[PDB]
Design a protein around this ligand. Structure first.
Ligand code: BCL
Ligand code: BCL
Ligand code: BCL
Ligand code: BCL
Ligand SMILES: CC[C@H]1c2cc3[nH]c4c(c3C)C(=O)[C@H](C(=O)OC)c4c3nc(cc4[nH]c(cc(n2)[C@@H]1C)c(C(C)=O)c4C)[C@@H](C)[C@@H]3CCC(=O)OC/C=C(\C)CCC[C@@H](C)CCC[C@@H](C)CCCC(C)C
Ligand SMILES: CC[C@H]1c2cc3[nH]c4c(c3C)C(=O)[C@H](C(=O)OC)c4c3nc(cc4[nH]c(cc(n2)[C@@H]1C)c(C(C)=O)c4C)[C@@H](C)[C@@H]3CCC(=O)OC/C=C(\C)CCC[C@@H](C)CCC[C@@H](C)CCCC(C)C
Ligand SMILES: COC1=C(OC)C(=O)C(C/C=C(\C)CC/C=C(\C)CC/C=C(\C)CC/C=C(\C)CC/C=C(\C)CC/C=C(\C)CC/C=C(\C)CC/C=C(\C)CC/C=C(\C)CCC=C(C)C)=C(C)C1=O
Ligand SMILES: COC1=C(OC)C(=O)C(C/C=C(\C)CC/C=C(\C)CC/C=C(\C)CC/C=C(\C)CC/C=C(\C)CC/C=C(\C)CC/C=C(\C)CC/C=C(\C)CC/C=C(\C)CCC=C(C)C)=C(C)C1=O
Ligand SMILES: COC(C)(C)C(=O)C/C=C(\C)CC/C=C(\C)CC/C=C(\C)CCCC/C(C)=C/CC[C@@H](C)CC/C=C(\C)CCC=C(C)C
Ligand SMILES: CCCCCCCCCCCC[N+](C)(C)[O-]
Ligand SMILES: CCCCCCCCCCCC[N+](C)(C)[O-]
Ligand SMILES: CCCCCCCCCCCC[N+](C)(C)[O-]
Ligand SMILES: CCCCCCCCCCCC[N+](C)(C)[O-]
Ligand SMILES: [Fe+3]
Lengths: 302, 281, 240
């Protein structure tokens, strides 16, 4: 066996690394967490520090509130019985208001009110988490790519739980909080819209989802294949092309007739991924607002 | 015809079969014995598809569809116009995929790089073989395979899944999906991170991988690192396809009822099976 | 119909994105060239993008790409055929001349630096606080080449300080000088470090570093190129 570089043969530790400072407010960083030797076979061994300023606390607080609101409902459905709680965990479900409440807050707690409370908490958890994504990059002087990409995922989420429900005139359209119930909702969504396999945005979203696995398999394997020339030091390969970056390009040029650069592969990357949820949100948002049945729409539209 | 840096790498050697016979390029493409093999298998397959097109009616890409033998034929051969073209085309397809992997191996050897790419591609090929070969064979007929057509192959996915109820409930499929979604999450984060470092705020100097580790420690308390993230994308991807192939090879063979009912093993565990309340009592 | 509009727009967007992305990926290695280094007539249908400039940290200057491309080193290879598309044969020893899978690029002859401006990679003995934390410590093991002959002994690990990882083993030879070996090209075993790519006699030919406690990008490329090259060129002396 050549060694394959999937796991490290030797770990090496030094002083806890407290990171770069730039414009970060340091009063907001924890200290370092412990070191995981377990993790260190595969990635970095070090845990933390983490930064938690105000927006981070806010986000984490609603996040947990969203989670606890759901879990209290679950416990209730379980009749406060721990054994029934574990037995039926995947079956419980926090459902939105029935259609007749429309977009209002008039519905009872036990029949939608709670769903709206949990959703409110989710809304602020995520958008504050987005803000934090933008802010931690700014403090460090970095591009805003992470936040722009996160926004593509937030787009699908918004469409599912907020924008499409509002356009359709009721909260009853949104996704319930439960393990099995959300799968049921997904299957139902497709049946009721005459089979999402005919939504061309759905087909596109799939091509990107498969394409992301294709591309990360390609890229992950490529970088490991040239890691014996320092391939994974991609920033310095961008600044000053090495043999790693040349052998990687040429593997692809010789295989399929064209290739990327060390920087440009990351642009192929971010876009293959982001287009999953972008075309996805479009396909969902059109469903039942403009197109009631995709099989039908497809008969009229190539 | 060459990249500016390309010449020094185009030396003889690396080939697995043929010595120097096919050791050359056409424009950008390396050839090798396995480039000849892939051209042959692929050209034949495409020809037979064009033939099969005629035997069926159309030249519309949205209509051309090549169906395997009907179930009546079992695992035997079949007249060409009734499933045989399919069988031959399937052999061509596999022949082309495996040839393409082996040609990728030849390019690795010439370039002095590891074999991770063909090794990864082999997982795609195995999933394909699961659908067209392993599963049909375990089930007793070619006709359980999917047909080759843009839209008809989707019909088969939908039909096959609804044979077992909502296919969401297949637990290996759950894991597969999880890997797909996580892979795409990782891929977005990866591309975004490197680019955010290489393209910083206007006028600033390029960041370093230290900034990349810092960004992520700041954000979630952990950073997997620049080796790790490439390990991770490769693993998430291959694990998605591995579980995909798993979720299908077990369906119609060891499990053939409605997948939602499989989950009863959990709810019927003696300690809690009969306790009243909740959803299942 | 709104959904028709959206899909038609989307395909047009996608065409533009692909164009944008492919031109972004032409910032290195282009314009294409003929085997003799002049511009090829057929550049394909995508033009070069407008230059961008990266600002390098620590006063290292700048990179603008695309820019004038050049190998900046002699390439000891010759045509084996009278037309395009065939291999180019080494004119001397391809390991020593650094071509084929032994190639290296003329990277800058400075060391990579961390975000603090310190040398990114250091021998561990000069790395304050750094030690092996898990797995077999290779320091002290004999080093075996693919000829099953002992080539030397590991005398340290060169580590990446900011990323906390092992990058090279420093191996001492019979003459008491040392060489770096890429961590991805060695197998650490309980009694031994084994090196598949090189036979024992090829260890002395590993390119040497000019200062004993740092390695430059140029040196890393020569070392990594050279050892990866042994997979093809050592082969007369590999038995598994
Ligand atoms: C896309 C179309 C459907 C949909 C269709 C499916 C299908 C189909 C499947 C899933 C599956 C999953 N979906 Mg869903 N899913 C949708 C939208 C969502 C949303 C959301 C906020 O919009 C969430 C949070 C989830 C969450 C989940 C997870 C339970 C699971 C693994 C996801 C994953 O790998 O993510 C990315 C990976 C990460 C590691 C990020 C963080 C991971 C954790 C696990 C997120 C889940 C937390 C959640 C609160 C559960 C814990 C509660 C209990 C203690 C167990 N889905 C929409 C409505 N989803 C799979 C499954 O296993 O279902 C049971 C599955 O087969
Ligand atoms: C994988 C699980 C299912 C399946 C479920 C689905 C579903 C569900 C969807 C598709 C969709 C697609 N699938 Mg399918 N598909 C299967 C197996 C295959 C196989 C195969 C040889 O095994 C192929 C070649 C295809 C090809 C395709 C495409 C027509 C389309 C976009 C895929 C993509 O971008 O992926 C990622 C790869 C890339 C981005 C790289 C480019 C790949 C190109 C586009 C492949 C073109 C193939 C060509 C049209 C036919 C052969 C060409 C010549 C004969 C040589 N599927 C199996 C049976 N497939 C989507 C679609 O729009 O269908 C109409 C869709 O919604
Ligand atoms: C019977 C079921 C229907 C079907 C119904 C649907 C429905 C309905 C939808 C999809 C959607 C999708 N389906 Mg479909 N789908 C079918 C068959 C398929 C098949 C197949 C081979 O058969 C495949 C491969 C797919 C693939 C896909 C994906 C391309 C797409 C979801 C992308 C995504 O990343 O979402 C996962 C990502 C998200 C959900 C974004 C989540 C972002 C938020 C911000 C995360 C919050 C995290 C939260 C706070 C919890 C944190 C906990 C942490 C631990 C801290 N479907 C059949 C026809 N499918 C989605 C779509 O876009 O359709 C166009 C969708 O809504
Ligand atoms: C109504 C339909 C059912 C359902 C029924 C099925 C069925 C049936 C199947 C899946 C399979 C899958 N489903 Mg499901 N699925 C449903 C809902 C979903 C949802 C969702 C959000 O609701 C999602 C995300 C998924 C996701 C998934 C994946 C786990 C998996 C598809 C990937 C794969 O196998 O790749 C593997 C990749 C390949 C097979 C590609 C091989 C490529 C080859 C090697 C090379 C191609 C070369 C080519 C010809 C190109 C040449 C030309 C060049 C372009 C120049 N399903 C619903 C509930 N699902 C499939 C699976 O697991 O397959 C094993 C499967 O068969
Ligand atoms: C581009 C498309 C892909 C995408 C991109 C994407 N997602 C993103 C990003 C990006 C670019 C981020 O930057 C952001 C991030 O920070 O990632 C690390 C993120 C993110 N995507 C996430 C999840 C997610 N993304 C998904 C999908 C996708 N993301 C797409 C495939 C999915 C799917 C497939 O369903 C999920 C589930 C998060 C990890 C993160 C957004 C985090 C966020 O908004 O947090 C708000 C909530 C909280 C801060 C707290 C909630 C805590 C509770 C849920 C409990 C904790 C866990 C519990 C199980 C144990 C502890 C509890 C005990 C007290 C009992
Ligand atoms: C295993 C993880 C993911 C993966 C990995 C992966 N794929 C790969 C690789 C790797 C590592 C390559 O190295 C190789 C490559 O060269 O990429 C550019 C490749 C590849 N994966 C490809 C496609 C592909 N991969 C897919 C998926 C995946 N690939 C997984 C998600 C899919 C999906 C999801 O559907 C597709 C369609 C190609 C771009 C390329 C391999 C090209 C190849 O084999 O060329 C030789 C063969 C031909 C040129 C054509 C053969 C044609 C005929 C024989 C007849 C047609 C057959 C028939 C099956 C048609 C079906 C019609 C459809 C409508 C259903
Ligand atoms: C850091 O490094 C990296 C690079 O480089 C620096 C890279 O480039 C890449 C490669 C990745 C890209 C270039 C990104 C774009 C790639 C995708 C989105 C993946 C999908 C790719 C395709 C859709 C193209 C498919 C093309 C194929 C399969 C070949 C096309 C076939 C022909 C037209 C002729 C094929 C030749 C044959 C038949 C064989 C032998 C030749 C002859 C006999 C003639 C990666 C991963 C990378 O990590
Ligand atoms: C330049 O470099 C880079 C780095 O380095 C400097 C980096 O640090 C990073 C940053 C990367 C990180 C900090 C790590 C990111 C972490 C992830 C994306 C997640 C990884 C998680 C896993 C390894 C496991 C995922 C779990 C799965 C898919 C299996 C399971 C699963 C589920 C949901 C259960 C299975 C299904 C059932 C049977 C029951 C369902 C159960 C549930 C309740 C759920 C990046 C991006 C990078 O670019
Ligand atoms: C152990 O017990 C305790 C109590 C400790 C627990 O805490 C246990 C907790 C649990 C067991 C909780 C388990 C949680 C789940 C199973 C949740 C699973 C959730 C999903 C599968 C979510 C899928 C999709 C969710 C979506 C699409 C949400 C979209 C929501 C947003 C778009 C929100 C929109 C906002 C609204 C509607 C608010 C409107 C009002 C305003 C004023 C804005
Ligand atoms: C950033 C990379 C772009 C890759 C694009 C691949 C497109 C695949 C074709 C899917 C066909 C979808 N549709 C709706 C016409 O059915
Ligand atoms: C849907 C996939 C389309 C295939 C894309 C493959 C492009 C390869 C281009 C080869 C370039 C060769 N040449 C002589 C034109 O330079
Ligand atoms: C035919 C024109 C259609 C428009 C397509 C536009 C694609 C541009 C892709 C985004 C480029 C990213 N950038 C430069 C803004 O950072
Ligand atoms: C789905 C992704 C397909 C993207 C295909 C775009 C490839 C263009 C190939 C151009 C290469 C031309 N060349 C060799 C002259 O550089
Ligand atoms: Fe990368």
């Amino acid at each position: 066996a050549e060694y394959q570089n999937i796991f490290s043969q030797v770990q090496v530790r030094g002083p806890a690394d407290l990171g770069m400072t730039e414009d970060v407010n340091l009063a907001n960083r924890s200290g370092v967490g412990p070191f995981s030797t377990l993790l260190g076979w595969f990635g970095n061994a070090q845990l933390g520090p983490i930064y938690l300023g105000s927006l981070g606390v806010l986000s984490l607080f609603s996040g947990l509130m969203w989670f606890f609101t759901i879990g209290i409902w679950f416990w209730y459905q379980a009749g406060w019985n721990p054994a029934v709680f574990l037995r039926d965990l995947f079956f419980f479900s926090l459902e939105p208001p029935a259609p007749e409440y429309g977009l209002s807050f008039a519905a009872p707690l036990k029949e939608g009110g709670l769903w709206l409370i949990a959703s409110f908490f989710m809304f602020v958890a995520v958008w504050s988490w987005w803000g934090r994504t933008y802010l931690r990059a700014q403090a460090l002087g970095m591009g805003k790519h992470t936040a722009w990409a996160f926004l593509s995922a937030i787009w699908l989420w918004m469409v599912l739980g907020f924008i499409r429900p509002i356009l359709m005139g009721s909260w009853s359209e949104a996704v319930p909080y439960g393990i099995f119930s959300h799968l049921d909702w997904t299957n139902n969504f497709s049946l009721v819209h005459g089979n999402l396999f005919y939504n061309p945005f759905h087909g596109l979203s799939i091509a990107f989802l498969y394409g992301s696995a294709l591309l990360f398999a390609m890229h992950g394997a490529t970088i490991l294949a040239v890691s014996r020339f320092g391939g994974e030091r991609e920033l310095e390969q961008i600044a000053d092309r090495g043999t790693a970056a040349e052998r990687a390009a040429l593997f692809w040029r010789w295989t399929m007739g064209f290739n990327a650069t060390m920087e440009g592969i990351h642009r192929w990357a971010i876009w293959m991924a982001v287009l999953v949820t972008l075309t996805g949100g479009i396909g969902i948002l059109l469903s039942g607002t403009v197109v009631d049945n995709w099989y039908v729409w497809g008969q009229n539209h190539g | 015809a060459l990249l500016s840096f390309e010449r020094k790498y185009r030396v003889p050697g690396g080939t697995l079969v043929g010595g120097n016979l096919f050791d050359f390029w056409v424009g950008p493409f390396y050839v090798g014995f396995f480039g000849v093999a892939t051209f042959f298998f692929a050209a034949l397959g495409i020809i037979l598809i064009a033939w099969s097109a005629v035997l069926q009616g159309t030249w519309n890409p949205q209509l051309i569809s090549v169906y395997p033998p009907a179930l009546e034929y079992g695992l035997g051969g079949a007249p060409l116009a009734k499933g045989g073209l399919w069988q031959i085309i399937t052999i061509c397809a596999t022949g082309a995929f495996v040839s393409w992997a082996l040609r990728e191996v030849e390019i690795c050897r010439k370039l002095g790089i590891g074999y991770h790419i063909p090794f990864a591609f082999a997982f795609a090929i195995l999933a394909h073989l699961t659908l067209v070969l392993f599963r049909p064979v375990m089930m007793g007929a070619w006709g359980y395979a999917f047909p080759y057509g843009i839209w008809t192959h989707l019909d088969w996915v939908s039909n096959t899944g609804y044979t077992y109820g909502n296919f969401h409930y297949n637990p290996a499929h759950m894991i597969a999906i999880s890997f797909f979604f996580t892979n795409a999450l990782a891929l977005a984060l990866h591309g975004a991170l490197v680019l955010s470092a290489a393209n910083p705020e206007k006028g600033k100097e390029m960041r370093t991988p230290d900034h990349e580790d810092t960004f992520f420690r700041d954000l979630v308390g952990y950073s997997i690192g620049t080796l790790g993230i490439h390990r991770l994308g490769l693993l998430l991807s291959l694990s998605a396809v591995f579980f995909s192939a798993l979720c299908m090879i077990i369906t119609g063979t060891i499990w053939f009822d409605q997948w939602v009912d499989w989950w009863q093993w959990w709810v019927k565990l003696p300690w809690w099976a009969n306790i009243p309340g909740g959803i299942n009592g | 119909d709104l959904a028709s509009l959206a899909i038609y727009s989307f395909w047009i967007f996608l065409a533009g994105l692909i164009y944008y992305l492919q031109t972004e990926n032409m910032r290195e290695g282009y314009p294409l060239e003929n085997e003799d280094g002049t511009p090829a007539a057929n550049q394909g249908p995508f033009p070069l993008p407008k230059p961008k400039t990266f600002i390098l940290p620590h006063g290292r200057g700048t990179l603008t790409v695309p820019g004038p491309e050049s190998e900046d080193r002699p390439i000891a290879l010759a045509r084996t055929a009278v037309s395009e598309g065939f291999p180019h044969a080494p004119t001397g020893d391809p390991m020593k001349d650094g071509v084929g899978p032994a190639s290296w690029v003329a990277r800058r002859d400075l060391p990579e630096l961390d975000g603090h401006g310190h040398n990114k990679i250091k021998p561990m003995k000069a790395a304050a606080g750094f030690h092996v934390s898990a797995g077999k410590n290779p320091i002290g093991l004999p080093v075996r080449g693919c000829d099953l002959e002992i080539a030397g002994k590991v005398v340290d690990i060169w580590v990446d300080i900011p990323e906390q990882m092992a990058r090279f083993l420093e191996v001492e030879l019979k003459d008491g000088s040392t060489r770096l070996l890429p961590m991805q090209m060695v197998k650490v075993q309980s009694n031994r470090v084994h090196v598949n790519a090189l036979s024992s006699d090829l260890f002395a030919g590993i390119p040497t570093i000019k200062s004993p406690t740092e390695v430059t990008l140029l040196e890393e490329d020569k070392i990594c190129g050279y050892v990866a090259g042994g997979l093809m060129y050592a082969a007369p002396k590999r038995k598994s």
